[PDB]
Design a protein around this ligand. Structure first.
Ligand SMILES: CCOCCCNC(=O)c1c(N)n(-c2ccccc2Cl)c2nc3ccccc3nc12
Length: 275
């Protein structure tokens, strides 16, 4: 883990509050004093007392992966604490939490351009991940964090190298995970954002989510969704993975939509639509 994660001195970390329950232990917020003496807000994941050696490996394994990525739209690893206990992973602080829970608090309260900004950040982060040869496999709005300035960053590197609702049909069918299956997931995230955090496929049985999508059914346009953005979803959800856009193309599409907000003016039987 120390190839990609710096070892932090525990004396430089202040823990202020527990803010969540993680897979391996509590998540806290606090402050980190940098070698320059600058103090920054951080999130702190702790490894629970009485951990097994395997838990320690899987815990720190995330830091090993996260530490390979230095990008504005990927959660920044500040470092780890391993030489003292509790074992910790320290990352940049994201004031507004998970993107899906954030948007649910704000239904219909953002502009389309604000939402497109969020989406462009996520796409940029994914473009870099895929450039680096990583397939995330768990790209979902719940695994995107959002800061005080609404900047969105990819998080949760525990499953990367299954979440049925976010997974492409071929990855469900025979574990064909590629950057193009991450693009499928991105289309689902795009739907989540434009739906202000609605659950994809609501509470449909997983068996029906699998069967419906395989038959060609797709999530319907979110309320007041621009046609450009719904078409982007449909493109991300092409049955043939070779026909899905690459993340670089997605970033380019969104940059155009940011540039000419007017374009967004054009707005878009069964719950799901047959394409
Ligand atoms: C409602 C607003 O809450 C914002 C709290 C601050 N959150 C962060 O900055 C987090 C943050 N940077 N991480 C995180 C993500 C990936 C790797 C390491 C960490 Cl510490 C979190 N992992 C979490 C796991 C479970 C629950 C809450 C969590 N919050 C955060």
């Amino acid at each position: 883990v120390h190839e990609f994660a710096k070892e932090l001195d525990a004396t430089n970390i202040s823990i202020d509050k527990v803010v969540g329950a993680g897979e391996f232990g509590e998540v806290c917020s606090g402050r980190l004093k940098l070698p320059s003496k600058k103090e920054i807000s951080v999130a702190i994941k702790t490894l629970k007392v009485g951990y097994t050696e395997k838990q320690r490996r899987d815990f720190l394994g995330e830091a090993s992966i996260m530490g390979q990525f230095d990008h504005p739209n990927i959660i920044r690893l500040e470092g780890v604490v391993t030489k003292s206990k509790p074992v910790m992973i320290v990352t940049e602080y994201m004031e507004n939490g998970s993107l899906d829970s954030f948007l649910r608090k704000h239904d219909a309260q953002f502009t389309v351009i604000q939402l497109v900004g969020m989406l462009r950040g996520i796409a940029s982060g994914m473009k870099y991940l895929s450039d680096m040869g990583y397939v995330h496999r768990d790209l979902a709005a719940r695994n995107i964090l959002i800061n005080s300035n609404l900047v969105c960053k990819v998080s949760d590197f525990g499953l990367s190298r299954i979440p049925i609702r976010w997974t492409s049909p071929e990855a469900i069918a025979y574990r064909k995970f590629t950057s193009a299956s991450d693009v499928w997931s991105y289309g689902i995230v795009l739907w989540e954002v434009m739906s202000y955090g609605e659950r994809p496929y609501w509470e449909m049985s997983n068996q029906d989510v699998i069967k419906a999508v395989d038959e060609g059914y797709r999530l319907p346009p979110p309320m007041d969704c621009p046609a450009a953005l719904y078409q982007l979803m449909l493109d991300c959800w092409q049955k043939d993975r070779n026909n899905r856009p690459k993340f670089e193309q997605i970033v380019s599409i969104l940059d155009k939509l940011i540039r000419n907000p007017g374009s967004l003016k054009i707005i878009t039987p069964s719950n799901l639509l047959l394409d």
